[PDB]
């Protein structure tokens, strides 16, 4: 579970992410596609190329879903109820892919926030992420 201190750290890191979330959304999405080719199988229709104008837009939609998840940290299962049916009915993406993306938001999030991504914030974020993933997989 998420602890009060965990919550707090999540909010101060994403607060810094700020307006660059889609940027970050996307950079991650890309790292994912390159470091773990299998994740591409769920986006056969996307233009998956470096610079892709579809990859950026998606990324946003992702980052924005996370922001939304933050602002509703105490009630994530319902705050994301829809993206839950989506990722487990229509799409049906395997839980492991969720760990891969997670591992990339952290990395993307790490190269851009040198000063804030302390051990504590990395411990916190990793857990928030695990949480957001658990809701979208259940």
């Amino acid at each position: 579970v998420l602890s009060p201190a965990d919550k707090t750290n999540v909010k101060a890191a994403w607060g810094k992410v700020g307006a660059h979330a889609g940027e970050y959304g996307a950079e991650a999405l890309e790292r994912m596609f390159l470091s773990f080719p299998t994740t591409k199988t769920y986006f056969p229709h996307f233009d998956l190329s470096h610079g892709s104008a579809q990859v950026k837009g998606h990324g946003k939609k992702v980052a924005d879903a996370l922001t939304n998840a933050v602002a509703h940290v105490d009630d994530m299962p319902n705050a994301l109820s829809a993206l839950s049916d989506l990722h487990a009915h229509k799409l049906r993406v395997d839980p492991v892919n969720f760990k891969l993306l997670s591992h990339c938001l952290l990395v993307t999030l790490a190269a851009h926030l040198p000063a804030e991504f302390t051990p504590a914030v990395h411990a916190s974020l990793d857990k928030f992420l695990a949480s957001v993933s658990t809701v979208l997989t259940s």
Binding site: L34, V107, A110, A111, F117, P119, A123
Partner: protein
């Protein structure tokens, strides 16, 4: 380990800039903080109860330098990880009883940390190479358990 010449280059290159005295401390340290259970393995390190205690623990910094040395030493033999790690794989199995699954985590905590030190330089493709290299090292260490 299908490492294209380019990846092999991008890898080695970057690594020439790493300060293994400094980065290995960080990794093993972060491991102990983001993955709490992975302390059941160093009760000999003394206090490990707060992030500050872990990160600053001397025994941690020393130990991580060791680990990172073996890594560096696997990067100087990309084409033969299974062998290079044979003795150290056995050890982690027969003597330390570490579930191989924990090699991937440290391997990943590292990838995070490299991205933390280099920033923009830790570009996606370099990452792809690195993911390939930790994946292999985790398998090399895992390949002698019976």
């Amino acid at each position: 380990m299908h490492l294209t010449p380019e990846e092999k280059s991008a890898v080695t290159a970057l690594w020439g800039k790493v300060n293994v005295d400094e980065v290995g401390g960080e990794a093993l340290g972060r491991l102990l903080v983001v993955y709490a259970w992975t302390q059941r393995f160093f009760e000999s390190f003394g206090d490990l109860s707060t992030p500050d205690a872990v990160m600053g623990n001397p025994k941690v910094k020393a130990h991580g330098k060791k680990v990172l040395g073996a890594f560096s030493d696997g990067l100087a033999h990309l084409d033969n990880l299974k062998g290079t790690f044979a003795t150290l794989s056995e050890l982690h199995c027969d003597k330390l009883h570490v579930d191989p699954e924990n090699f991937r985590l440290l391997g990943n905590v590292l990838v995070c940390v490299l991205a933390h030190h280099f920033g923009k330089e830790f570009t996606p493709p370099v990452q792809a190479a690195y993911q390939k290299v930790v994946a292999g090292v985790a398998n090399a260490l895992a390949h002698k358990y019976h």
